[PDB]
Amino acid sequence: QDSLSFGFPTFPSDQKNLIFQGDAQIKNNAVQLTKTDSNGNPVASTVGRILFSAQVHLWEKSSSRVANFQSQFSFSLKSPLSNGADGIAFFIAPPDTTIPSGSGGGLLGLFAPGTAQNTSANQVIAVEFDTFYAQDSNTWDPNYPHIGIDVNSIRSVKTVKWDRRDGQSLNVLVTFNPSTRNLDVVATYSDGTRYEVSYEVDVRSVLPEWVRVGFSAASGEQYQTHTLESWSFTSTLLYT
């Protein structure tokens, strides 16, 4: 299809079009990307991701078209600790993507340790909401919580200072305009606090024509729940 759109206002347990990887599962009408115990508390050493089953036609060499896309979603992070880890990310990757071995903790379930910073060995675009930045283990991170745009590397090409708020839902709008090639990210808390980050990227040189979209999250030694509450997505191939 030249166009595709879907909307999940909530996430009932009766799911048919979601690919669950790692510890991800539906609980209380929301997707819990990382593992939790019986009491519902987050646990250490867990990775989880979800992908929508239908493949998205991001670009078509045949007609020289590139798709625009808009992903809107909300999530909340909760933890008994003051420094919850590691973060959640919206990502786009080849259809057969799977959790790389050893991609836990700060690698957010998106990159393999040995090639996490090698841009020629990866095929992924992600928008991360990173809450852990200790320089001993996350040497690639700025020294503060942040939102970042990742293009084939865990070391973001662009970041913006962000504030983690335990239990509060963050509303996010990610849009890609093929005409300007700008990937824009706008995130806001209910009180109006807004964060914005943008980057120019030619998706044709990073990803294959058909891709899958989804979310990934992980917790290493530090932990927090990564609860995806809602998600809507739309893409349309355009000639610019």
Ligand X SMILES: OC[C@H]1O[C@H](O[C@@H]2[C@H](O)[C@@H](O)O[C@H](CO)[C@H]2O)[C@@H](O)[C@@H](O)[C@@H]1O
* 208 binds a copy of itself, rule: CB under 8 A: no
Q: Least Å distance between CB 33 and Ca ion?
A: 15
Which residues are bridge partners to 198 per DSSP? Answer: 184
**Residue 22 or 106: which CB sits closer to ligand X?**
106
Contact window for Ca ion (CB under 5 A) among 56-64, 111-119, 122-130, 166-174? 122-130
Pairing between strand 3-8 and 225-238?
antiparallel
Q: Choose from Mn ion, a copy of itself, ligand X, none: what does 53 bind? Cβ within 5-8 Å by kind.
A: a copy of itself
* 8 binds a copy of itself, rule: CB under 8 A: yes
Pick from 38, 39, 62, 82 the residue near a copy of itself by CB under 8 A: 62
Contact window for a copy of itself (CB under 8 A) among 56-64, 70-78, 165-173, 216-224? 56-64
- For 21-37, the DSSP string reads EET-EEETTEEE-S-B-
* 192 binds a copy of itself, rule: CB under 8 A: no
Q: Where are the beta strands (DSSP E) in the chain?
A: 3-8, 18-22, 25-27, 30-32, 46-52, 56-57, 59-60, 65-78, 87-93, 125-130, 146-151, 158-161, 170-177, 182-189, 194-200, 210-219, 225-238
* 156 binds Ca ion, rule: CB under 5 A: no
